[PDB]
Amino acid sequence: RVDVMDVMNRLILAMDLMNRDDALRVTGEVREYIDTVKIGYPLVLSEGMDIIAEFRKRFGCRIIADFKVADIPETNEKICRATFKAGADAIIVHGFPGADSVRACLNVAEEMGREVFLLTEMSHPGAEMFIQGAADEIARMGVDLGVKNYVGPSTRPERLSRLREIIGQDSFLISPTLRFADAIIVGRSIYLADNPAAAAAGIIESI
Amino acid sequence: RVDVMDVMNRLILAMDLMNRDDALRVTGEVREYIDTVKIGYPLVLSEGMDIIAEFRKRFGCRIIADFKVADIPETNEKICRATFKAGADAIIVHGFPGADSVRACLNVAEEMGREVFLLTEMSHPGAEMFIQGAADEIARMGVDLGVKNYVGPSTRPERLSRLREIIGQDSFLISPTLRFADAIIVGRSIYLADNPAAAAAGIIESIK
């Protein structure tokens, strides 16, 4: 789809290592296979937000900030602004705090020319308690607000098809499958592999 | 209560300013009235996590990291560990992602001798959609897991009474009232005032 991001090889690296040397080194080993990297709080809190600009300059990659933004609207605005100022191309935001909290993020993203990904569901066991039951309504909330980028789980394929039905065929969907999602997110299988390149290149072979 | 934190004057400063100079300056202006300061992501992402240790050293204050932790268990562990290593005395965690996500935080806090605050509810308008309906069950989940520190909203007094009933009389409850909560959180009324010290001192006079 032209109006949503192009992710090289439909493979997003979840760079969840917490030290700068390893994150930069392991990312380097697989740089030829991916142009989009997802980073989260453990890395940025440990090493500083300046690491975002570092990735983009050293590897030329898009950065998705997996910050699971989940505050009140005013605070969400400030988190998004700081994150985009640091160079992030996109930010992942929770839907459970409701529509105004999501809209706050969309406002800043539109202002600054960046993207919001709405996290519709999670797949860790505790997600059954509240998240699973809210997933469909959160996805619909996103659609109603004009959200064009979504994160959904891959552990249950039939959940991905359901998400697709809600968000439509054109919105961008990434999942941690490619019949429904536009790109897959892979972390450990790559960054822990004794040969990250052998892991990455292999995954792209199947894709 | 002896086994939960003593907050000076029952007043927590929500230091939500985003630049280091102002945050340190305005905090300095009201330093004698508070020993517990809540810091969030806008400040820490803008200025670095090193600012946490700076607050504790310059003001001798306790720091609560209002990071609204809301990830999977493994990632929650790492966020908590990084935050505690940076010197935070406590961290605020969402309950919506469920019990294992909360327990991950509790594990690290117990290891490192720090505290987890469970956020049971929020008071912005959008909170009605999903958070309001989950609040009682989240508070009960906290109790069942041995959580001793909670954050609840104050805009609805009768919600604080309900929360207090669930968590019992001894757990520590903070809220943005003092008949139910152990301490109140104040931000803008203090840090955005021609004379923050006048605001802080005044608030403390009402508390008796």
Curated annotation (Swiss-Prot), chain A:
Record-listed E.C. numbers: 4.1.1.23
Keywords associated with the record: Decarboxylase, Lyase, Pyrimidine biosynthesis
Reactions it catalyzes: orotidine 5'-phosphate + H(+) = UMP + CO2
Keyword Lyase: yes
Biological process according to GO: 'de novo' pyrimidine nucleobase biosynthetic process; 'de novo' UMP biosynthetic process
Cellular component GO terms held in the UniProt record: cytosol
Positions of substrate binding: 16, 38, 66-75, 123, 187-188
GO molecular function: orotidine-5'-phosphate decarboxylase activity
Entry superkingdom: Archaea
Cross-referenced Pfam families: OMPdecase (PF00215)
InterPro entries (alphabetical): Aldolase_TIM (IPR013785), OMPdecase (IPR014732), OMPdecase_arc (IPR047595), OMPdecase_AS (IPR018089), OMPdeCOase_dom (IPR001754), RibuloseP-bd_barrel (IPR011060)
Pathway stated in the Swiss-Prot or TrEMBL entry: Pyrimidine metabolism; UMP biosynthesis via de novo pathway; UMP from orotate: step 2/2
Catalytic machinery residues: K68
HAMAP family in the cross-refs: OMPdecase_type1_A
PANTHER family: OROTIDINE 5'-PHOSPHATE DECARBOXYLASE (PTHR32119:SF2)
Subunit structure: Homodimer.
Annotated function: Catalyzes the decarboxylation of orotidine 5'-monophosphate (OMP) to uridine 5'-monophosphate (UMP).
Family from the record: Belongs to the OMP decarboxylase family. Type 1 subfamily.
Protein name: Orotidine 5'-phosphate decarboxylase
Underlying gene: pyrF
